[PDB]
A paper describes a structure:
EHBP1 was originally identified as an Eps15-homology domain-containing protein 1/2 (EHD1/2) interacting partner that plays a central role in GLUT4 transport and couples endocytic vesicles to the actin cytoskeleton. In our previous work, we showed that EHBP1 is an effector molecule for Rab8 family members, including Rab10, and forms complexes with 1:1 stoichiometry. Our biochemical and structural data suggest that the interaction between the C-terminal bMERB domain and the central CH domain has a regulatory role in the function of EHBP1 and binding of Rab8 family members to the bMERB domain releases the CH domain, which can then interact with the actin cytoskeleton.
Subsequently, we investigated whether a mutation at the CH-binding site of the bMERB domain has any effect on Rab8 binding and could show that bMERB hydrophobic mutants still form stable complexes with Rab8a with similar affinity. We were able to solve the structures of the bMERBM1116A:Rab8a and bMERBF1120A:Rab8a complexes to resolutions of 1.914 Å and 2.0 Å, respectively, as described in materials and methods. The complex structures are quite similar, and we describe the bMERBM1116A:Rab8a structure in detail. Similar to previously reported bMERB:Rab complex structures, the major interactions between Rab8a and bMERBEHBP1 involve α-helix 3, and some additional interaction surface is provided by residues from α-helix 2. Hydrophobic side chains of Rab8a switch I (I41 and I43) and switch II (F70, I73, and Y77) are buried in a hydrophobic core of the interface formed by α-helices 2–3 (Y1149, L1156, L1160, L1179, L1182, and V1183). Several polar interactions were observed between Rab8a and the bMERB domain, including between side chains of T4Rab8a-E1200, Y5Rab8a-D1197, D44Rab8a-R1189, D44Rab8a-Y1149, Q60Rab8a-D1190, R69Rab8a-Q1176, Y77Rab8a-N1187, and the F45Rab8a backbone carbonyl forms a hydrogen bond with R1189 side chain. Taken together, our data suggest that the C-terminal hydrophobic patch is crucial for the Rab interaction, and the conserved arginine residue R1189 also contributes significantly to the binding affinity.
Author numbering:
A (entry chain A): 4 to 174
B (entry chain C): 1074 to 1203
Amino acid sequence: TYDYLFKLLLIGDSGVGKTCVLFRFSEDAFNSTFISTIGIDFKIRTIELDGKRIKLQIWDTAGQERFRTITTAYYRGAMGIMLVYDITNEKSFDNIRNWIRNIEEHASADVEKMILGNKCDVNDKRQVSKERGEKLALDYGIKFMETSAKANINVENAFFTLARDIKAKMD
Amino acid sequence: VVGELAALENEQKQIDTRAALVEKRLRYLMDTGRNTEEEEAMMQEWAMLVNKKNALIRRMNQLSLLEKEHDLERRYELLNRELRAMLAIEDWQKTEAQKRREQLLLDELVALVNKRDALVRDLDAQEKQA
Ligand SMILES: Nc1nc2c(ncn2[C@@H]2O[C@H](COP(=O)(O)OP(=O)(O)NP(=O)(O)O)[C@@H](O)[C@H]2O)c(=O)[nH]1
Ligand SMILES: [Mg+2]
């Protein structure tokens, strides 16, 4: 009932919007309520990309410090990782290089990474400009997108680009 | 469709007991070489009854995996709401046994996600063989 299964992972600080980005992609809605993730979860959405059925198993990590030893066990065998920060929160953008060092110390060698600057609908609280998210990911050799789970900006584009980068690598 | 899956288990019992009543006949009509007319009629039934058994097993596989997936999701959704209520209580208010009770609840929650992940892993190995 599908062709291939891809394992995806969402990492970043608590409150950057990891669960909301996945809830926008897998169920086309947005929750305003901060419901912090406990430990680790995953969601399934099967897509139709380029004539082919692709189920995505997207793991959603808890960003709080007390769950970080649980979430480190799920890096190996991730085929794609989103590093999410909040464009309204300077410190979560600063913490992306800690999450870069958490990826390369635990994940696989060929894993395709992608930086998401989430909450790009909140212009009056923007602390990290769009040009600085573009230059950091170009420095890492990594694709960049500004997303908004609330405004449905580039969420479906982020997952369909990360599955296109997986499916081209099989070919 | 819980009443379907119990009906298909007795439908499977109707199929392979009819198939056991066919295979000894088709062996005896081939080894002794008795009737070529009822050998054509028994081979097209036994090829039908094996392919009807295979279609009934794989539909029973996809109903049993969906029933386990629904049960593990509602046990996950329940235990996550119990843990969210426990972790919202402060550290000093609960006893030391209640703090180690909520650690076991957290370990059981990671165990349920790994059980749900195992159903994904099992369905991946099933489709590449099918
Ligand atoms: N304006 C706006 N708010 C957003 C957006 N995405 C998430 N939020 C808000 O930010 C908060 C945190 O979202 P959440 O998805 O829980 O973040 P998280 O990274 O999963 N948190 P944790 O790691 O603790 O589980 C929520 O109140 C949510 O409504 C967005 O694109 N725009
Ligand atoms: Mg979350």
